[PDB]
Design the sequence.
């Protein structure tokens, strides 16, 4: 088939920066190339058709060019809402093939995570499990550490965390750590602590509560 | 343009099950529909072209049916290699619209969400806007439904959700539903509720707060 080679695999640039992504077809595909934008968790959206025709409704900062084997896509000045994975697709023939994609990540200033800790719900305890939740809100970069301490003893392999994709409004992340103990182990202890270390934190922040 | 609506948005199933997704167009598009498969972090792959033409190389457990406005896709026996997100796309005319997608995932121990509700801070209300958040935490499968009620009335068109994509999928989700109201509207009501639904919950868990 026609192989589509996209580059780079991912990249980070500041808002206002020009972004250029390229695609090459294994063979001359004339001008039959489309560019899609895939926001996190959404269906892909067409931005550019036939190598350079900008779809109506798409911001003018997007543009494509080239023909034959080499093609390129450009974002004049990167904005928070451009956070997505861009794909090029050749439509010279079936099977319509896509390139690997390119994750663009917005670089921005360091933001300190504002943190909260939430004790298990009595309704949750009734199921045989207690989940203590620790929330790290609006931070940058993503590299953040969250260590659990139950009665001063460090925890391991009983924590699970979900971090969000970079926010399209302010380019920050939010993370949620969850300590899961059986109702028995939970009742055996009093102090539940969550130690969050981040780059915008001079010293590790510790949130905690005393069991009822 | 032509709007494509898929169904369901996600589904959990065990290896060997017969799976069926649907896709309906806002207007007759003949057989001009493609069905893609997208593994996490991969570019979509065309599986079916022209409504029911299996692309050379795809396994026969995959089938397509439909014409005009109602289409469907079927997997005779779900195989572990089929766990992914599927899309339909119409190519009757630009902008080559893609449906929302249907995430097909494996059945596992049902994990119920611990919902939390956060009211707007005074600093934000200063801005003239009011956003009340409702976090669904650490759940599974992804199928969940957050419903907002203000002074016991059902709201619509004023909330936004962002599901945390799970990376290394022997995991769980987190979902935020943000209801934005103008300051004046926010101060015109008392009770703000968020009623979530999930298969882990025996009954819809309604979480709320009273302005004040």
Sequence:
């Amino acid at each position: 088939d026609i192989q589509m080679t996209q580059s780079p695999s991912s990249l980070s640039a500041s808002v206002g920066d020009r972004v250029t992504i390229t695609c090459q077809a294994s063979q001359d595909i004339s001008s039959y190339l489309n560019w899609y934008q895939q926001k996190p968790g959404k269906a892909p959206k067409l931005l550019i058709h036939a190598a350079s025709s900008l779809e109506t409704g798409v911001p003018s900062r997007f543009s494509g060019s080239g023909s034959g084997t080499d093609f390129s896509f450009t974002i004049s000045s990167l904005q928070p809402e451009d956070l997505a994975t861009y794909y090029c697709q050749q439509y010279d023939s079936l099977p319509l093939t896509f390139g690997g994609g390119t994750k663009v990540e917005i670089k921005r200033t360091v933001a300190a995570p504002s943190v909260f800790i939430f004790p298990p719900s009595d309704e949750q305890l009734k199921s045989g499990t207690a989940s203590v939740v620790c929330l790290l809100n609006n931070f940058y970069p993503r590299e953040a550490k969250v260590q659990w301490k139950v009665d001063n003893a460090l925890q391991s392999g009983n924590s699970q965390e979900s971090v969000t994709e970079q926010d399209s409004k302010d380019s920050t992340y939010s993370l949620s750590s969850t300590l899961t103990l059986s109702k028995a182990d939970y009742e055996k202890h009093k102090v539940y602590a969550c130690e969050v270390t981040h780059q915008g934190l001079s010293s590790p922040v510790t949130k905690s509560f005393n069991r009822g």
